[PDB]
Design a protein around this ligand. Structure first.
Ligand code: SF4
Ligand code: SF4
Ligand code: SF4
Lengths: 114, 70, 176, 144, 318, 156, 208, 56
């Protein structure tokens, strides 16, 4: 409940700041002031059109590696077992498989872009 | 010169110092002049609840020693 | 006659390889740059305490235009209009008529401080030293019209800054 | 150690400005607490100081007067407040202060220097200095 | 009285952020042969307050093309998360003592990234979109290596409890044990806080203002406060993790002073790096992390897993 | 009146905040921009006074029109001025910006930036010296110090 | 036109600073036109003044006096120092360095002071004119220039220390913008653009 | 400069050079602002004979 109280307090402070920023100042909003910013000239197309991601493969591989991040976090408690031999073998197996995956993607020109 | 930078650093240092000191002294005040007990495992929380029961004022920090015995 | 930037080949001996490997792994060159920044941190700053401290200027500085007078108090201008002629931006408008004394004086002398390029001409061009760009540089205005000077304004500036203008002209008159 | 000497110099700065009150006054007004030789003071009240040891551009400085031409300048100071005679000394056009080398005395020269008057009732307003060129006919005042 | 403690953590941290702005301006100026702000207040002390007042008295503009809900929510999320992450830190005693505080901080840092992406997308401006995509690439580059380095270092701690780091480093700093991981961690913290040489999201030189190009007045102030608070919090995390401090239980003030000084030094190092080095290209940042940091981190993680076993130094779980 | 005193003091606080923190936008058209950079340089560092160059128009408070404003650039300048949140102040630097200067009679030059956007302080010169620009900025700060928004609100 | 952040097509739109200089020169005398050339390249004013002066002198069939020529060469080299300081420092600032800018702009201020002492204008002086130079050097300027030059090398070395061998800076610039020598020649490139590609051409030597 | 010996050593070591020898800030080495009056020489054509403009 302490964490809930702290989160509420921080969020309430931020929201109060937003309210004070949108209500204390004076405003003269007109169309040209609220128009999109394109370094002085007007935008050609929208900013909601597709924006090609030249690093898509790296992103999917990032998901797959975050899985390994999840799998490796229990290691601090794992070192507390009595079968330290099997624990060490499996931890090094997982880390070597992650290394192998990285090496494969790298050598196959997967970490490169475009 | 470069020493002119120091006053802002001192103000920032005091501002940063306030939180930890405030936390420590607030813990001391709430927990009867002793550090707030750390319950990272269920056993310690059970000890705290037993101390709460023993105290008689429903405050764990209140410590009953040999005097309560017999 | 010509020099080769780059065009150097690294040594392949084990010591040089180890040094470059240490540079890559141990970030030596970035640390050198950090040390340079720290040394600059400990060097004396170059900021001057404006307005209380003012930057150096020479007697040949070109600032606010001014109309000077003779020691008698007569205006030096003789309505030559050659200073108008040489103005690169056509910022000077001059009209003249024979004055009551009969002298050739300017009924109108206007310098648009908004069309002026502060070239320094018409100080060289003007034959009698009447028009001079004085030392003043802090004559900013809150309105555009304030910067369209008039003969009265220019003469007031000349009277205001004559003490400095005369000394600067004395300093640089031999170079001219 | 040199550190003790630097701290003692800071205390000397405190004393040289007339005490803690003067030290704070100078610190807030000009943001500089250096103590330098007083070369002179103009009629308007501006005091001019010189410290040749300090590097070029900071060797000469001026402490603007708190009152000039009926304006409170304790906080609001401007470069134009510097009178022309001290202008060349302050801007390093000359090495001789006006006190040592007075400017030539001319009758037309102003006796009271005015600061920039933009935004004030004394602001310059442009106008034509020439008379009407074309004169119109004045109709007769008799009916006929 | 816990509310008093929460306010004591929050309010002083925000003032620290405000004066950090002054410190940065002055430190960069002096490293550039300049004097940082000095006119406003004695030695520039009151400049932060003037900046905050100016920003909060300035008109906030809602872009015509913006999605207002996300546009407003993003700064709130950034500031609230920035303040929240300070809670678990032991200084020396944490406000909230969690068994898994480190994973909490990692998750909260992950959550804060969406503030940048949501702000950039809601702005509905091309530069803001480019900044958001750069933030996405930056997280992709740094998150895995950050997690692996933290795991490797915490293997010696024996837990993810931040408080127990003090006990582990009672006799020596952990930087001596893991100085390479410390270097990679410092660079990764620079990347996470979007600080130079990895200031890609904002990227003023290349993107006019990045994600905050369409933010003005209070929301921009909130983004700035979140940024600086994250800088300070991450440097404090580094100080706790590697540059441990002596804690006398009867006198916590000594530990607090030592910790604050170390964190100040690390933040000053942050400003120093911003002054010294140029900016990376986001392709280059991702390449650095994935091709250079990731393999070394994997090898060192294997090493740190093995070392407690082969040296019989497995840390106590409790 | 006590209300008048409170309004005056709050107006003092707001004006002090606005003048102390003046953030010019990174807008330089022509040669006058170089003198602006020299103003940003260590000798006359403007950061001391609280003037920090910020690129984004929405995160800026002052626009300094340094350089000639061509008919081609004028719409962009007006757009940048409009997108700038208020309070916003404009400083015109150089003869070209003030009234067209050397290129007053050119077909491709706007004879002054006053025609396109309102100007608060005109800094004369071609190029104006960095000290002159600093003087103009301080004059704008004094102009802000003289503002009476809240007093007028109370009196209205 | 950007696919992602890759630039498929870069189309430069110019004329945002077209002030009709050439049309205006036709309405001005040769002396009046001289200040225009200062404004063309704000960073390198005196070199443009020298180019105009050389053209007018060649047409006039008149020869500048030798001391005028030596003054022109000296101040042209000072202008080159200013221009290269600006170019390198602003390039680094755009790529994010941002400290050599201030460091070197202090020296730029000093060189501006030399400009002011000779002409009274920190920049855009009309010092170099057809037929020579307007005014002789103020006494004491040469020794001050010597004082500046004796120390400038350290500043250039510190800038190199900041940028020359930095991994980040080399990454940002090592292989970007490659131009073939034949392409450089055909496209009309001059100066460092040609010499960077390896063509050996400097008009100061080839055509002094 | 006015730097203490400790700061001078620190800066010199960080730079790798002796900063004191070459200081960017300018001190009494600069030329005096007031200078003796000059006597500029005349040019080749300032002659009272054999100077007809047709020749030159
Ligand atoms: S020198 Fe000046 S005042 Fe005299 S005639 Fe020429 S323009 Fe007129
Ligand atoms: S100095 Fe001023 S008045 Fe003289 S020619 Fe130049 S612009 Fe015209
Ligand atoms: S006013 Fe002069 S210095 Fe400024 S842009 Fe125009 S020509 Fe260049």
């Amino acid at each position: 409940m302490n964490i809930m109280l702290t989160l509420l307090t921080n969020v309430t402070l931020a929201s109060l700041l937003v309210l004070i920023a949108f209500w204390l100042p004076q405003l003269n909003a007109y169309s040209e002031k609220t128009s999109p910013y394109e370094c002085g000239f007007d935008p050609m197309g929208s900013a909601r059109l597709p924006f090609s991601m030249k690093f898509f493969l790296v992103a999917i591989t990032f998901l797959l590696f975050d899985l390994e991040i999840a799998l490796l976090l229990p290691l601090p408690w794992a070192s507390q077992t009595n079968n330290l031999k099997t624990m060490l073998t499996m931890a090094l197996f997982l880390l070597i498989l992650l290394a192998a995956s990285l090496a494969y993607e790298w050598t196959q020109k997967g970490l490169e872009w475009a | 010169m470069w020493f002119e930078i120091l006053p802002g650093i001192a103000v920032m240092a005091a501002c940063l110092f306030i939180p930890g000191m405030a936390t420590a002294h607030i813990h001391k005040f709430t927990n009867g002049g002793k550090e707030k007990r750390v319950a990272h495992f269920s056993y310690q929380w059970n000890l705290m609840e037993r101390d709460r029961c023993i105290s008689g004022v429903n405050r764990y920090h209140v410590t009953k020693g040999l005097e309560n015995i017999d | 006659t010509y020099k080769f930037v780059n065009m150097r080949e690294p040594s392949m001996d084990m010591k040089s390889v180890t040094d470059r490997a240490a540079q890559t792994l141990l970030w030596t060159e970035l640390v050198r740059g950090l040390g340079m920044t720290l040394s600059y941190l400990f060097r004396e700053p170059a900021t001057i305490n404006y307005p209380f401290e003012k930057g150096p200027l020479s007697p040949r500085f070109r600032g606010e235009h001014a109309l000077r007078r003779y020691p008698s108090g007569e205006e030096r201008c003789i309505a030559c209009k050659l200073c108008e002629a040489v103005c690169p931006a056509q910022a000077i408008t001059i009209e003249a008529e024979p004055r009551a004394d009969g002298s050739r004086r300017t009924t109108r002398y206007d310098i648009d401080m908004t069309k002026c390029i502060y070239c320094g001409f018409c100080q060289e061009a003007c034959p009698v030293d009447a028009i001079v760009e004085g030392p003043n540089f802090e004559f900013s205005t809150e309105t555009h019209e304030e910067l369209l000077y008039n003969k009265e304004k220019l003469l007031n500036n000349g009277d205001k800054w004559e003490a400095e203008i005369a000394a600067n002209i004395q300093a640089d008159y031999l170079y001219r | 150690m040199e550190l003790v000497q630097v701290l003692r110099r800071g205390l000397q700065q405190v004393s040289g400005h007339g005490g803690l009150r003067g030290y704070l006054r100078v610190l807030f007004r000009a943001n500089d607490v250096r103590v330098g030789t007083l070369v002179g003071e103009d009629k308007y009240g501006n005091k001019y100081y010189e410290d040749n040891k300090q590097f070029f551009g900071r060797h000469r400085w001026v402490i603007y007067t708190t009152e000039m031409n009926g304006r409170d300048t304790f906080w609001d100071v401007d470069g134009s407040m510097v009178p022309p005679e001290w202008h060349r000394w302050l801007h390093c056009m000359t090495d001789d202060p006006p006190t040592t080398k007075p400017p030539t005395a001319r009758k037309y020269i102003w006796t009271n220097h005015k600061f920039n008057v933009s935004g004030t009732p004394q602001q310059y307003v442009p106008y034509s200095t020439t008379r009407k060129k074309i004169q119109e006919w004045v109709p007769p005042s008799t009916p006929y | 009285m816990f509310m008093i403690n929460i306010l004591s953590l929050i309010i002083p941290i925000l003032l620290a952020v405000a004066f950090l702005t002054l410190v940065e301006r002055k430190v960069l100026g002096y490293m550039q042969l300049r004097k940082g702000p000095n006119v406003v207040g004695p030695y520039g002390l009151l400049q932060p307050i003037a900046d905050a007042l100016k920003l909060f008295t300035k008109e906030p503009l809602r872009p015509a093309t913006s999605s207002i809900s996300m546009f407003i929510i993003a700064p709130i999320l950034a500031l609230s998360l920035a303040l929240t992450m300070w809670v678990p830190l032991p200084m020396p005693y944490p406000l909230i003592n969690m068994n898994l505080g480190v994973l909490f901080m990692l998750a909260m840092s992950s959550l804060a990234v969406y503030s940048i992406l949501w702000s950039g997308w809601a702005s509905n401006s091309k530069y803001a979109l480019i900044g958001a995509l750069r933030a996405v690439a930056q997280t992709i580059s740094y998150e895995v290596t950050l997690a692996i380095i933290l795991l490797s270092v915490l293997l010696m701690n024996g837990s993810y409890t931040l408080s127990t780091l003090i006990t582990t480093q009672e006799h020596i700093w952990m930087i001596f044990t893991s100085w390479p991981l410390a270097m990679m961690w410092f660079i990764s913290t620079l990347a996470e806080t979007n600080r130079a040489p990895f200031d890609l999201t904002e990227g003023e030189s290349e993107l006019v203002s990045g994600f905050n190009v369409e933010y003005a007045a209070g929301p921009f102030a909130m983004f700035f406060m979140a940024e600086y608070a994250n800088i300070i919090m991450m440097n404090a995390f580094t100080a706790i993790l590697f540059l441990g401090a002596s804690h006398d239980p009867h006198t916590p003030e000594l530990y607090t002073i030592n910790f604050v000084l170390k964190t100040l030094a690390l933040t000053i190092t942050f400003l120093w790096i911003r002054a010294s080095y140029p900016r990376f290209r986001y392709d280059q940042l991702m390449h650095l992390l994935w091709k250079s940091f990731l393999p070394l981190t994997l090898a060192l993680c294997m090493w740190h897993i093995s070392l407690p076993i082969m040296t019989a130094s497995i840390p106590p779980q409790s | 009146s006590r209300g008048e005193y409170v309004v005056a003091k709050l107006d003092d606080l707001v004006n002090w905040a606005r003048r102390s923190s003046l953030w010019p936008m990174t807008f330089g058209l022509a040669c006058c921009a170089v003198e602006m950079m020299h103003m940003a340089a260590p000798r006359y560092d403007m950061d001391r006074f609280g003037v920090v160059f910020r690129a984004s128009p929405r995160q800026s408070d002052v626009m300094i029109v340094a350089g000639t404003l061509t008919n081609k650039m004028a719409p962009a300048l007006r757009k940048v001025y409009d997108q700038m949140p208020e309070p916003r102040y404009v400083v015109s630097m150089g003869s070209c910006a003030n009234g067209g200067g050397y290129y007053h009679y050119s077909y491709s030059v706007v004879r002054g930036c006053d025609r396109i956007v309102p100007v608060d302080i005109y800094v004369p010169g071609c190029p104006p010296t960095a000290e002159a620009l600093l003087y103009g900025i301080l004059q704008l700060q004094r102009k802000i110090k003289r503002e009476k928004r809240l007093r007028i609100w109370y009196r209205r | 036109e950007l696919s992602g952040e890759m630039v498929r097509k870069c189309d430069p739109h110019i004329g945002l600073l077209h002030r009709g200089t050439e049309k205006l020169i036709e309405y001005k005398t040769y002396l009046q036109a001289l200040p225009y050339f200062d404004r063309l390249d704000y960073v390198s004013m005196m070199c443009n003044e020298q180019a105009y002066s050389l053209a007018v002198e060649k047409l006039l069939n008149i020869q500048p006096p030798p001391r005028a020529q030596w003054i022109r060469v000296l101040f042209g080299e000072i202008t080159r120092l200013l221009n290269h300081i600006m170019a390198v420092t602003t390039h680094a600032l755009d790529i994010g360095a941002m400290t050599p800018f201030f460091w070197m702009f202090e020296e730029r201020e000093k060189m501006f002071e030399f400009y002011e002492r000779v002409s009274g204008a920190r920049m855009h002086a009309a010092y170099i004119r057809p037929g020579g130079v307007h005014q002789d050097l103020p006494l004491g300027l040469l020794d001050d220039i010597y004082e500046f030059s004796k120390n400038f090398s350290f500043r250039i070395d510190e800038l190199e220390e900041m940028l020359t061998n930095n991994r980040i800076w080399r990454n940002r610039t090592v292989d970007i913008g490659v131009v073939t020598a034949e392409d450089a020649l055909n496209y009309g490139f001059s100066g460092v653009m040609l010499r960077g590609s390896g063509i050996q051409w400097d008009l100061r030597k080839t055509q002094p | 400069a006015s730097a203490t010996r400790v700061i001078q050593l620190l800066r010199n070591w960080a730079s790798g050079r002796d900063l004191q020898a070459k200081l960017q800030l300018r001190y009494q080495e600069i030329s005096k602002r007031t200078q003796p009056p000059p006597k500029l020489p005349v040019g080749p054509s300032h002659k009272l004979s054999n100077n007809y403009y047709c020749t030159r």
